[PDB]
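To assess whether the prediction recovers the assembly geometry, we first specified each molecular entity separately, as shown.
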Amino acid sequence: ATVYLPPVPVSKVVSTDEYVARTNIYYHAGTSRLLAVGHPYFPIKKPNNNKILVPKVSGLQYRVFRIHLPDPNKFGFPDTSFYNPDTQRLVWACVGVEVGRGQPLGVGISGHPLLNKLDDTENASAYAANAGVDNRECISMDYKQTQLCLIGCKPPIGEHWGKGSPCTQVAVQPGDCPPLELINTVIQDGDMVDTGFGAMDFTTLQANKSEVPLDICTSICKYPDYIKMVSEPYGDSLFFYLRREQMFVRHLFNRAGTVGENVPDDLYIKGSGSTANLASSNYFPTPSGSMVTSDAQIFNKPYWLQRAQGHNNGICWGNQLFVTVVDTTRSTNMSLCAAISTSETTYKNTNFKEYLRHGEEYDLQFIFQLCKITLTADVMTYIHSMNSTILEDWNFGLQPPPGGTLEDTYRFVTSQAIACQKHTPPAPKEDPLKKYTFWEVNLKEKFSADLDQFPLGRKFLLQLGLKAKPKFTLGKRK
Amino acid sequence: ATVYLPPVPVSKVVSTDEYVARTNIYYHAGTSRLLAVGHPYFPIKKPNNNKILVPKVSGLQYRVFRIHLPDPNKFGFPDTSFYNPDTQRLVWACVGVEVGRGQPLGVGISGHPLLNKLDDTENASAYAANAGVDNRECISMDYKQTQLCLIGCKPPIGEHWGKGSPCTQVAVQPGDCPPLELINTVIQDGDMVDTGFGAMDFTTLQANKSEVPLDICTSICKYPDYIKMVSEPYGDSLFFYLRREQMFVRHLFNRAGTVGENVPDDLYIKGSGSTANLASSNYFPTPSGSMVTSDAQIFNKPYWLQRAQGHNNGICWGNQLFVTVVDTTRSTNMSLCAAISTSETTYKNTNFKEYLRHGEEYDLQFIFQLCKITLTADVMTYIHSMNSTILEDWNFGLQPPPGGTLEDTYRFVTSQAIACQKHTPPAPKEDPLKKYTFWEVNLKEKFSADLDQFPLGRKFLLQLGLKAKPKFTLGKRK
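The predicted structure of the complete assembly is given in tokenized form:
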């Protein structure tokens, strides 16, 4: 005819849901309530090995979850007269996410036994000046409140400051502290969130390497970059996000070490004592939360999707979801000990072996609407400019008489114990949306037609208004 | 395209029997008999040199001929064209072949002066007769009866177990058999059939290199890989095969050499005497050829190809036919002698020097049908997806150049240089064969249009139209 085919144009820019037709077939899925039990400070490892016994897990750390979904076409159902692959394909839409939380109220504990600290800024108890005696006290604090969630379907980018271009002398010095330049990179699980010492590295950035707690000392601090993802024009990176966050200053303190900083002698009169001695500008705010209650949560509340913020409506492109959740409002650490031999009721370390843990619970409950994509060449070719991969998976054509399979393929192991060998099996693979480890959530075996067995789907029913479904009734309670 | 490469196919692969029309125009061809006189055991080379004086020829190896055919569109025609040469193109179909044997009934023979054989273990005589220095014997066999012929147009696939190489994950040393991996390769001329040790290489499995005859040590031994071929729908690699093979167990024997195996020493009770020790548990059945009969000849009777395994029925996508023949049943070895001197007037075995040859005949008679493939735009797209080279060879749009200009080396002549001279003169040239290893039969003008005076022909007229004979055929009763 036709022949060819413009895309149809990329510079005609449209909803990513002007060609995705929803249907009223709904399924439910969720988890069992996943648990990770770490140590807040670091991992407590075997000291003969690098293998962990106790990981490092807190709520002050990124919980990045990789939700996996089948292609719906490939998933069976007992009734299926809504898809024909000679005409259409299928793709999931998630239309509701409930974040179950079930932990006590409590907050993560962070500290350094050799935290740099000299005097009180809040008082004038002692001087901040030159000091060749460097004080290091055992101080601990809880970090700031961070609650957020983002639900997306592609990997999400947080920003931090790295060490950019260098200085011409050594770094972290008067007048030769280097240029710190912004490296946006994908959020990592179990790397640190923002902590109230800002979002940056500390290993190479901080060359003292001892002024800040252990959990962020060896680790990067990063904050999710919202601006960038909402300035992407398909909004697949994320398409829903929310936050509730605040810091409280525990107290400003001043670090020990001498003064390198310049004090102009044209801004103060000369005398004796104080008016002839230099002053430290080595203050650090101490991060802490302002108040924490379980009614100050943003969690435990259903999120009803029906047209995402992004140009998505909440479509699982690739049939995956990337959920990155932070919760600190609950992030309790529990202390335990084991007596090996009581022989005095008064503490001894040949008795009571103190232990610290943090236990972390999360549940994710879901209702997924099925939607369809028609196989139209104009849509297909436009999808191809956006990303060819969904198309290639569906598979179209030759295969001249047929290559790859069949052929007839393949030979023939099927391992025994000889087996056939040599082997060295073929390689390890990385997923194309995986760059960094996530807390994997497989969902490929839990789909229910009925939604009355789960409180998240009922609540969806009542909110939906089919058929027509109470809603509420009173009382409650009273 | 678009849509899309095509569709559909794949799945369901369009037969070349829905738009490829047969015509009633027949040509006839055949060969003038083929004769090759070798030495089956080894080629006899001049050992002062490296070149053959008697080749290796045998019916106990594949005789695989690469037949190259004209194309009908090269002809000036006798007027077989009534339509435009771009609405259709012409291709041959071969509709009957007879493969004749000119060799008498009687088998060929192979052997080895030092076949690795210890003692007889069918019914004892020993446990071992040796486990030190030497023990091999003068022993000959005719390998198993195999008759088969198979016809394709692309190269056949063979299977054999190649050397999987000793592994060091599971304990296998030299002096233990390797794990064995099936390494499949094209059936090519000079290659040996299956011997009933399995079908495997012997060039690097054998390390004495003298367990078996001179002939199979220096070949790859193969079994036909029917399995992958009959799973190509088109069947371009073969669209015809048949087999008849059989073998009987002559006598159980034990190989020369000591166990390398690990025997659990707890599956018997120890004796006293001869019964205390163990023989070598390297027993092998000794195979041997079958009785030859004229009711086993699959040859000198016509194989029709009016219908074929594939969609292919001899349809030229290269203008080549591959015909593989095995005949072990008329592969007579004829014995003869010449006297070294007439200085010896008595009977001596240092006088009359026995010599063996094998003479090998093949004749192939062919009847060729003229066929056409009707081309529409849609058809042309299917072929383009299929194998683009076919369109170009036929000659079909759309080709760039132009092209131009200048050139260099201008005037004069040379003349010194000046001028230019670069110089620099072109074309190595290099290099792919695409021979690969076949007995070349050129057919290009052995084509005819009468088929009343070829024997195959007469029978084909009888079968097709029920006429003409020409007067009469057979009996009656008789």
